[PDB]
Write a protein that binds this ligand. Structure first.
Ligand SMILES: [Cl-]
Lengths: 134, 134
């Protein structure tokens, strides 16, 4: 039986790095809520999947997620990480630059019965677009 | 002798909201390191104080720090918060708009002997500048 931290590590590897949506289905609960979802997006699992399949993986190639630290209290796991990838597609209105960039992020995940139940995210887009524009 | 969560709560109220640098001197250690310090800035307490006195408080008036949650493990405290303020000064290339904006942020603080010892930050500047431009 693997830990909440282990489940988040598996999600970052199989879903964010590899883009395995079969792994997504296995690691995200049907009652999942993305509290950080923008006002126009579905806070549900389908909205969350749509961010990876429709936005992230079309924009970023050769994704490497560097998990620096994981702080856990009361079933919530804070992951401080870096998303390193090659900018090969339009990202936040920025056309493909071919540049390898590093996005600093922090997410808070609530894992229940081996699946993602609740999620909050924070990312340095200002800095990532600055990298793209240099 | 108050908790790490209470020290961070006091720092956000007296330093970030009120701009009391006398409180800064009392709540930040001399060996403090800001791991999220920009490339040209000092990771030291002097560099960190300079962010508030030199860029944050000249840019933002009537600051309100809305602390949502605090997750602690192994001497690290993650604070998920929303900085609400009026844009009255120069902020990341945007001249004063007079708008009251909300900056979503997350910081990881290591409190040692009632003072700030280590710090990591994440803030939604992309979102904040978007608000300034609306
Ligand atoms: Cl994520």
């Amino acid at each position: 039986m693997d830990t909440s931290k282990a489940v988040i590590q598996r999600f970052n590897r199989e879903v964010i790095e590899n883009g395995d949506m079969a792994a997504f289905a296995e690691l995200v609960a049907p009652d999942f809520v993305n509290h950080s979802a923008p006002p126009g997006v579905s806070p549900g699992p389908d909205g969350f999947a749509g961010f990876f399949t429709g936005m992230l993986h079309p924009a970023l190639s050769d994704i490497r997620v560097h998990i620096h630290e994981q702080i856990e209290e009361n079933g919530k796991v804070v992951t401080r990480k870096t998303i390193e990838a090659t900018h090969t597609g339009a990202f936040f209105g920025q056309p493909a630059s071919g540049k390898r960039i590093a996005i600093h992020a922090m997410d808070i995940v609530v894992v229940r019965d081996g699946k993602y139940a609740e999620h909050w995210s924070c990312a340095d887009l200002y800095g990532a677009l600055a990298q793209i524009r240099a």
